[PDB]
From a paper:
We present a composite map determined by electron cryo-microscopy (cryo-EM) at resolutions ranging between 2.9 Å to 4.9 Å of the entire T5-like phage particle [name], and atomic models comprising its core structural proteins. Our results provide a complete atomic structure of a T5-like phage, provide insights into the process of DNA ejection as well as a structural basis for the design of engineered phages and future mechanistic studies.
The reconstruction of the capsid-tail interface, here referred to as the neck region, reached a resolution of 3.4 Å and revealed the presence of three proteins that enable the transition from capsid to the tail tube. The [name] (PrtP) forms a dodecameric ring, which replaces one of the MCP pentamers of the capsid. The PrtP ring interacts directly with a ring of [name] (HCP), also dodecameric. The interface is completed by a hexameric ring of tail completion protein (TCP), which connects to the first trimeric ring of tail tube protein (TTP). Since the negatively charged DNA should experience significant repulsive force when passing through this region of the portal complex, the dynamic nature of the HCP DI β-hairpins may contribute towards preventing premature DNA release. Furthermore, our cryo-EM map resolved the secondary structure of the N-terminal part of the TMP as a trimeric α-helical coiled-coil.
Numbering used by the authors:
A (entry chain D): 11 to 378
B (entry chain E): 103 to 378
C (entry chain C): 103 to 203
D (entry chain B): 204 to 304
E (entry chain C): 305 to 378
The structure:
């Protein structure tokens, strides 16, 4: 097998969580806008990729002998009698993103999402994984779970078994930004705004002094009153003063922008999608976002499903309305390939989502 | 790939009909006196024979010796910068909590009843702020003097912005990913930059790996990108390329079907060159 | 669409040959122990059977639990900003009336 | 430093330290509310200025020069360190390959 | 469209029919009269799409002349 396994087993005999700060993470997602938007964009975008089921490899596996039509119906249409496909996918992608792991039970003809925060993985001494422990209260056998994990480098060990949370790296910034914003507000409420200072060495009757202050205040403001010249007598002195601390020095604007970029970068969504730009910007950036961020995630998932079932399994984007190519280019592509006798007609109908037409010529190559 | 990047080495066991990853942090390589490598030692506790391991290493120049056997970690060169940047960011925060913001200073040589003085401070504070209160003129009597002051140290002088940007560039550069991929730019920027990133950074790594596998197995082995959805070429150009080569009798039809991922068609003419 | 955006959920009754909107602020969802959902409770005063409601929910991550059943309101994340802006605008006005020229 | 206060009298050290901590926690907007300050018995506020400032450490071009020197010694164009536009990027690879390697 | 996909996926779960939203009534989206004509014409003349399919896409009633439901090869 692998002689080293008995030693590797002791380097990390049981998985451990990586999403520390779970409460403050749920607060942040529930309260901070840019996190909520970027996470919802990723989840809602990944959930709508269709899956295609390919050919079958001859190798033996756990989920033996399942007919293709069933697997297709389970993946594309109905995971189990009680839960839809979209809710199932969004749950799995939520676990995969936030915790860094995802687990799915299988029960002959049912797939069930199993919450990643309660599972635990126990290493085998000879094979890869011995059993999965749920809530310390039930053990799942290895051939009854589908397991997915993100990358993991932990405590200076490259980590099998465990998965790094993606979102865990972002909380540090969400705190600092919130602090700045609160300070930016509260400086205004702690503020102090004086219009004039008058001064004497005499002592003045307090009640009359207060009345005089209210008279000056209402009279001099242009909104309330008319008067503007002021004549002081008996030695009241006007004291020149200056604003000893000013709002001008709170030029936060670039620092908070940095934190927004960090958050936006951790998910890996281009800023053009947060802004909207020009056409030349916008149309390629969607393909950037889809291919670089989402498709590696789905490749992790599909490679785990092909390992478990043994069928070739891979995701199809061409249902996605966002990606769907331009009606002009596709027509010249398909037409030119069809007329030059590289591709049969019905293959083009298929690529245009059209049913094949049974006229034999439509399945013939035309040479000229 | 994690081991190859972080540690700088990777090891794979082979067992007749199995390949197993072996953690790079626990392996050690012992030099032979006549051949290249004598044996591999794992955790000082088991020795793997040389013909049972596949070995990959990144470049290595160590202590002034060019180094066989050993591999330099890539990520090890980045930590110096991650520390300094974090320090600046923490300082940037903590200056605010250590801050001190005064609105007014009033002064006397007399001594004043402390309790009434505190009450007066709270009255002035609540009255003068426009959010809380209305009053704005202030009349001082009995000789309380207003003392002019200035902000002796200001947030304006913490213009960190370019320095931290430098550190981000350093980190971004150590992996070798263009900034256009961190931003997203225009089309003319974006589409070539993906090919830059793939060909310059990734393909040399995979060439290291595949050259080690071809050495071990003896088959020609090389990586194919054309499954990668990011790279996959434009539907327009590819059609005119293939069509023009096919019609001018350089390439047979089924070769084009193959390049379009299509199954070859058994009509003999599809495997014939057409001259005109 | 108003219910789906503001509350984060939407419910529709079905009655053989009728669909009726049911206000999302008054519905409540009770989890089943074996199936997904046991029954829907309206105003604590009537229970709808599961096969008589169409249920829609937006995403939900709550108190550090990814949440089945519940839905996050979209508009709830915006109020914090609407307050601060209004404050600034009022201050911007009132400085003029408190002015002195 | 946030503030400097000064006297010719001598003050009880323990109470002086307590007073410093009270002022520090009270005046910062994050910790506390108060903002006006009333000094009595002759404590004077001393105006001061930042005698040496971070603003004068404008290193940015000098270090950029050193990066260019290093980048130049191998002979790799900066467009390969940045990534630019297509017209920049595609010829620069041929420049790097043909001239240096 | 993601919102409407949430709704329609719930309705397809409940009824079991395929259900999906059509935008092409929306006057804001409705494509340019020039491009659509060259798209449809080129597909029709090259014998990929039958005539009545084009009439349908232009919101026109199908015409019962048999040829209008024939592909034209050349």
């Amino acid at each position: 097998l692998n002689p080293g396994q008995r030693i590797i087993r002791d380097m990390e005999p049981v998985s451990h969580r990586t999403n520390r700060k779970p409460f403050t993470t749920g607060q942040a997602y529930s309260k901070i806008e840019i996190l909520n938007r970027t996470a919802n964009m990723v989840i809602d975008s990944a959930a709508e990729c269709s899956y295609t089921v390919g050919d079958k490899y001859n190798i033996v596996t756990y989920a033996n002998g399942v007919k293709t039509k069933t697997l297709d119906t389970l993946l594309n249409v109905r995971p189990n009698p009680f839960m839809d496909i979209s809710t199932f996918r969004r749950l799995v992608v939520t676990d995969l993103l936030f915790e860094g792991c995802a687990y799915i039970y299988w029960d002959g003809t049912s797939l069930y999402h199993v919450p990643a925060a309660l599972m635990q993985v126990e290493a085998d001494a000879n094979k890869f994984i011995k059993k999965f422990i749920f809530n310390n209260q039930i053990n799942y056998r290895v051939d009854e779970i589908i397991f997915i994990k993100d990358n993991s480098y932990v405590c200076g060990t490259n980590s099998q078994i465990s998965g790094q949370s993606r979102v865990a790296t972002v909380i540090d910034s969400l705190e600092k930004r919130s602090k700045m914003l609160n300070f930016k507000e509260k400086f205004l409420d702690n503020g102090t705004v004086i219009g004039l200072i008058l001064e004497t060495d005499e002592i003045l009757n307090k009640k009359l002094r207060e009345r005089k202050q209210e008279e000056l205040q209402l009279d001099y403001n242009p909104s309330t009153g008319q008067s503007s010249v002021l004549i002081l007598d008996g030695g009241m002195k006007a004291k020149p003063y200056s604003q000893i601390s000013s709002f001008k020095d709170l030029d936060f604007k670039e620092d908070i922008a940095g934190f927004n970029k960090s958050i936006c970068l951790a998910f890996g969504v281009p800023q053009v999608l947060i802004d909207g730009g020009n056409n030349a910007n916008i149309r390629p950036n969607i393909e950037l976002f889809y291919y670089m961020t989402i498709i590696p995630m789905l490749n992790k998932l599909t490679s785990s499903l092909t390992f478990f079932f043994g069928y070739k399994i891979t995701p199809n984007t061409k249902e996605v309305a966002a990606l769907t190519p331009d009606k002009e280019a596709e027509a010249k592509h398909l037409t030119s390939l069809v007329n030059n006798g590289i591709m049969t007609g019905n293959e083009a109908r298929l690529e245009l989502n059209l049913e094949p037409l049974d006229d034999e010529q439509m399945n013939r190559i035309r040479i000229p």
